[PDB]
Design a protein around this ligand. Structure first.
Ligand code: E4J
Length: 375
């Protein structure tokens, strides 16, 4: 019975999705960003301009110091602090309490986000990328070891809350079939993209380019991030499709925003993006189709609530493909750790106009999918 965990997430793709958690004895309540792109559980533990509250180790009778420091650098931001353990619970999660590793953040740089309403981060990926090293057991590993919570969780991120189903799959959160792609290696949630189409036209690149470095699923990043060569081809194709309208080159860099009179956004001139993922069966893939309503991120114009403004949510990467929050929105994503696979289905909170639809479709036949992984 997962109904208690439905709608247990708040926040947005721009500043992160967070779940409520309690740490220590007596319980201290904190809002924690859910991050499938990392593996450290860390909380603000000292005053900071953008923190409304923080973990007070001194007030917890169950806190234990590990006398070890830690620092984590991300694509954006970094923090350092002191490692320790304490009792942790998830109010709108499974009814259980675990002793988990906790990094008490004492200094940070461009990590906390003004007005985000979260005070910590829950890294849900594997120990291989945990800092300072892989012997620091991540939270979800601790959860599975100390309780009977099954070794999987699912994320339903919704655009303009959501759900994190801890320990299972809630069939009422999606429609259609779940399609699974193998987790290539247990460090990030690494996957293999075997084909990319824009408005049904193949990008016709060596599929190794799509995974150049790696390809990961990351709820803790906003954008779809693409390696240089793929980003240029994708932007070139998207510009061509919307060429009847003018945008400054800063828009295509995610710097500048674009606006239109409310209700006149020309969605039809922006193409759909189809990402084909390696399937579970020999020579078989499936595809997920991304609408422009996902990669044109709505941004509030505080000057005049007249227009509808958007930011281009596709950016260039030097560390491989990242399927960020705008890609996961509208899909139900199953992180099936027990079976080393990630499932995609159309979400019940799917983004839809009236002419096109986000979709998860298969099967497709794709030869030599193994040659698409970077080495
Ligand atoms: C040590 C090995 C593990 C390192 N693993 C990463 O480094 C991954 C690739 C990355 C994280 O998901 C990071 C988590 C995060 C979340 C909030 C604030 C800072 C960092 N996220 C980003 O670094 C990132 C976040 C955002 N926006 C914040 C809202 C998130 C929905 N924007 C970016 O734009 C480039 C990058």
């Amino acid at each position: 019975s997962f109904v208690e965990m439905v709608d247990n997430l708040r926040g947005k793709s721009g500043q992160g999705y967070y779940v409520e958690m309690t740490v220590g004895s007596p319980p201290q309540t904190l809002n924690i960003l859910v991050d499938t792109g990392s593996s450290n559980f860390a909380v603000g533990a000292a005053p900071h301009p953008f923190l409304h509250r923080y973990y007070q180790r001194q007030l917890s009778s169950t806190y234990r110091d590990l006398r070890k420091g830690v620092y984590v650098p991300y694509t954006q931001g970094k923090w350092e602090g002191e490692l320790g353990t304490d009792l942790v619970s998830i109010p709108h999660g499974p009814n259980v309490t675990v002793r988990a590793n906790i990094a008490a953040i004492t200094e940070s740089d461009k990590f906390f986000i003004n007005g985000s309403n979260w005070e910590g981060i829950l890294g849900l990926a594997y120990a291989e990328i945990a800092r300072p090293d892989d012997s620091l057991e991540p939270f979800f590993d601790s959860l599975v070891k100390q309780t009977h919570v099954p070794n999987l969780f699912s994320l339903q991120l919704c655009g303009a809350g959501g759900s994190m189903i801890i320990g299972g799959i809630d069939h009422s959160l999606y429609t259609g079939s779940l399609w699974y792609t193998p987790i290539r290696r247990e460090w990030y949630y690494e996957v293999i993209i075997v084909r990319v189409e824009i408005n049904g036209q193949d990008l016709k690149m060596d599929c190794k380019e799509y995974n150049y470095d790696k390809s990961i699923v990351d709820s803790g990043t906003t954008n779809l991030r693409l390696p240089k060569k793929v980003f240029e081809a994708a932007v070139k194709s998207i510009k061509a499709a919307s060429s009847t309208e003018k945008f400054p080159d800063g828009f295509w860099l995610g710097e500048q925003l674009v606006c239109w009179q409310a209700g006149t956004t020309p969605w039809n001139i922006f193409p759909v993006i189809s990402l084909y993922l390696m399937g579970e069966v020999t020579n078989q893939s499936f595809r997920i189709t991304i609408l422009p309503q996902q990669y044109l991120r709505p941004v509030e114009d505080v000057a005049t609530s007249q227009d509808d403004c958007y930011k281009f949510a596709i950016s260039q990467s030097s560390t491989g493909t990242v399927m960020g929050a705008v890609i996961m929105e509208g899909f139900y994503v199953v992180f099936d750790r027990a079976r080393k696979r990630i499932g995609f289905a159309v979400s019940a909170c799917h983004v839809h106009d009236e002419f096109r639809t986000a979709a998860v479709e298969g099967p497709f036949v794709t030869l030599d999918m193994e040659d698409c992984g970077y080495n």
